[PDB]
Design a protein around this ligand. Structure first.
Ligand SMILES: [Cu+2]
Ligand SMILES: [Cu+2]
Ligand SMILES: [Cu+2]
Ligand SMILES: [Cu+2]
Lengths: 58, 58
């Protein structure tokens, strides 16, 4: 809901954002392992996390 | 739902994934401009897109 707890260790890294043009059509990838959230950790660092690697905490 | 249409041009680039440890607690950032989807374009390129920059097409 508001908070999650990590089920595994995870090593930081980058992911790329698609470039696209106005009016371009895109298909959404809906497999669970491809879903991400924006998160913030105890030290204020912000970044993406994979939903499948965490669980609802609060 | 399944497909989106881009409302603006968007230049490709990277975003970082948080590193975290098993059991660590994280807060989810829920502002609209921080939400992303996984998408695929006409040429098979895969990448992240910002929800606020597109609209439901199909
Ligand atoms: Cu990833
Ligand atoms: Cu961007
Ligand atoms: Cu971005
Ligand atoms: Cu990762």
């Amino acid at each position: 809901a508001e908070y999650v707890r990590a089920l595994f260790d995870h090593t930081g890294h980058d992911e790329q954002e698609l470039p696209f043009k106005k009016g371009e059509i895109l298909r959404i990838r809906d497999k669970p392992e491809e879903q991400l959230w924006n998160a913030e950790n105890v030290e204020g660092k912000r970044g993406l996390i994979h939903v499948v690697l965490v669980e609802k905490y609060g």
